[PDB]
């Protein structure tokens, strides 16, 4: 168990659903040649050599699950 | 107690159905006996234990 400060009154503020606006296409497939999102070996390292390695990796060029968040409703200030 | 039967519910997306099980017990002696399991790992990180 640990220290956690307790909360206040439990009137959760109003929450909307506007996924239709959220539906936007910014697909960024991953490039293995560009070497992005590539795990390192867990305990070892090399230098200036090419080596085959078996492990955990993503598939080449997936569209993925791009989600975003944004600001809420605002009327001036 | 021995012969106890336990169960719980499952969410619909995980295939439905009810998870069921049965358990058994062994009584104590005067002195308590316990079990230990050792496993060592080599290449997970820096060799440091």
């Amino acid at each position: 168990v640990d220290v956690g400060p307790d909360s206040v009154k439990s009137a959760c503020i109003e929450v909307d659903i506007q996924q239709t606006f959220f539906d936007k296409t910014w697909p960024r497939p991953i490039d293995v040649s560009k070497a992005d999102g590539i795990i390192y070996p867990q305990g070892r390292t090399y230098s200036n050599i090419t080596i085959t390695y078996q492990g955990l990796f993503p598939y080449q060029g997936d569209h993925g699950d791009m989600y975003v968040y944004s600001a809420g409703h605002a009327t001036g200030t | 107690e021995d012969g106890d039967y336990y169960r719980k519910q499952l969410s619909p997306l995980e295939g439905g159905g009810w998870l069921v099980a049965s358990g058994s017990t062994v009584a104590m002696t005067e002195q308590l006996q316990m079990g230990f399991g050792i496993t060592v790992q080599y290449g997970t990180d820096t060799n440091s234990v």
């Binding site: 640990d2 009137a11 959760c12 968040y69 | 969410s11 995980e14």
Partner: protein, 49 residues
């Protein structure tokens, strides 16, 4: 982004999907992105509006 991790899923009191059970891993960035708060603890729903 803020993450939730768990091995037990379910629907809420009104049947809305997103209810989890037992211990749950919570990831929350804070401090304007500088802090990476995280805990594997128990989340309990509130019964308000």
């Amino acid at each position: 982004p803020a993450f939730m991790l768990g091995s037990s899923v379910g629907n809420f009191s009104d049947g809305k999907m997103g209810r989890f059970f037992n211990h749950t891993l919570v990831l929350l960035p804070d401090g304007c992105g500088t802090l990476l708060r995280a805990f594997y603890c128990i989340l309990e729903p509130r019964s308000g509006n």
